[PDB]
Amino acid sequence: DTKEQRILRYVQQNAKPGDPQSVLEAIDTYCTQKEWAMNVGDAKGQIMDAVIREYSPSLVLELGAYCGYSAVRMARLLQPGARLLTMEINPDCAAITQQMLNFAGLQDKVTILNGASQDLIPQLKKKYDVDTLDMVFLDHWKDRYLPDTLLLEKCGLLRKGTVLLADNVIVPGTPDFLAYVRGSSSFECTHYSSYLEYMKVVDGLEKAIYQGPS
Ligand SMILES: Cc1ccc2nc(C)c(-c3ccn[nH]3)n2c1
Numbered sequence: 001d002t003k004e005q006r007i008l009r010y011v012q013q014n015a016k017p018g019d020p021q022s023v024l025e026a027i028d029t030y031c032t033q034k035e036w037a038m039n040v041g042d043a044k045g046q047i048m049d050a051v052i053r054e055y056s057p058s059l060v061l062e063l064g065a066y067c068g069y070s071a072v073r074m075a076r077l078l079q080p081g082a083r084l085l086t087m088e089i090n091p092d093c094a095a096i097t098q099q100m101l102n103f104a105g106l107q108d109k110v111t112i113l114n115g116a117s118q119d120l121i122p123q124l125k126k127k128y129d130v131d132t133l134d135m136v137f138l139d140h141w142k143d144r145y146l147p148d149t150l151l152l153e154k155c156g157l158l159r160k161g162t163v164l165l166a167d168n169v170i171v172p173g174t175p176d177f178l179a180y181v182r183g184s185s186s187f188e189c190t191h192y193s194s195y196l197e198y199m200k201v202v203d204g205l206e207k208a209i210y211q212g213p214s
Pocket residue numbers: 063064065066087088089090115116117118139140141144
């Protein structure tokens with residue numbers, strides 16, 4: 001039994017359906033209980049929340065779903081009419097994330113895309129009717145942060161003000177991505193520190209707002 005399975009089972013047994021906050025808490029509670037290092041957790045969750053509230057995106061792209069914690073986190077704050085597109089390379093994680101969202105009552109707002117970002121990002125404009133993204137949450141594989149950022153620019157998916165929020169830019173680290181956005185005039189960058197338990201290490205998120213092409 002994978003951890004994602006066990007998490008979903010726990011949520012379905014303890015949280016309240018259509019109550020996104022209770023789903024998030026049950027995930028946080030269980031993971032804590034089992035001492036599993038969380039992919040996001042509530043503290044980073046609070047940073048994601050503030051970014052969503054601050055920019056009120058109508059169309060969000062999430063790279064990496066895992067058990068669907070961040071998807072529930074983001075979808076619950078989206079306005080009616082808004083969409084979250086979530087890319088997940090692992091079919092089994094995709095399946096869990098769908099169930100998680102169904103249970104939270106948020107499935108209407110989310111489209112799960114199963115596959116690698118390098119395969120799926122170029123399909124956005126036409127297959128999923130995307131003009132430009134309002135926000136991108138990067139939480140997939142470290143070595144695809146910078147290439148996917150370049151790919152999103154190339155596909156014309158970013159506009160001035162598009163908010164890229166990247167997780168784990170310190171641990172395990174995305175230094176090349178950071179060097180790129182902090183040094184590019186195409187981005188305005190803010191850093192948010194946050195602590196990873198068990199490893200007991202300060203990690204961080206980078207917020208990088210697209211300014212348009214150079
Ligand atoms: C290694 C690697 C390459 C490409 C890619 N695209 C996505 C969405 C993911 C992923 C990571 C976690 N969940 N999904 N991914 C992982």
